[PDB]
């Protein structure tokens, strides 16, 4: 998921769900291996604590144009007809050059 | 209008920068649902009395 | 303190998640004034018992 070697298109993206194991977001938080790395409905500190039963990660390529759109409640050619997330979504985001 | 009526689903989940504003909201409701309650137990006590 | 009294002219004008906010503030004010009437009335149907 995150170190990948090659990401899907925004077109058709891979959908990897995660369960039953164990989860260091610590490296990930604190390695600067990524342009922007924030989150919208929990801490980017506090993903360790607050858990959860199910995890789901799609990964896939757009512009830097297009990075914006990939945010709760935005509008545009890939938050309307692409890839739409909810106004009450409860993820994280993540960006890299 | 919450992400959730509890405080531990706020106070370790999200940042005290939106967690303030999200704790705002319930202290602002169930303080009001107080002010409606004593206002009517204390209506109630003048019909008692 | 919205942008306009009439939800139709947010829900028809502004989009889903900025709307929600404006009607916020309607329904916390307009439900203000309910209990601001309802308090009246039940004082003054203690004074007419």
Do not use: H
């Amino acid at each position: 998921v995150f170190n990948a070697t090659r990401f899907a298109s925004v077109y058709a993206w891979n959908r990897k769900r995660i369960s039953n194991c164990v989860a260091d977001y610590s490296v990930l938080y604190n390695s600067a291996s990524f342009s922007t790395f924030k989150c919208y409905g929990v801490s980017p500190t506090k993903l360790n604590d607050l858990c959860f039963t199910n995890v789901y990660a799609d990964s896939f390529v757009i512009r830097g144009d297009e990075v914006r759109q990939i945010a709760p409640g935005q509008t545009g050619k890939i938050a309307d007809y692409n890839y739409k997330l909810p106004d009450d979504f409860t993820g994280c985001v993540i960006a890299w050059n | 209008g919450a992400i959730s009526s509890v405080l531990n689903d706020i106070l370790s989940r999200l940042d005290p920068p939106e967690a303030e504003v999200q704790i705002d909201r319930l202290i602002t409701g169930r303080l009001q649902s107080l002010q409606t309650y004593v206002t009517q137990q204390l209506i109630r006590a003048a019909e008692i009395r």
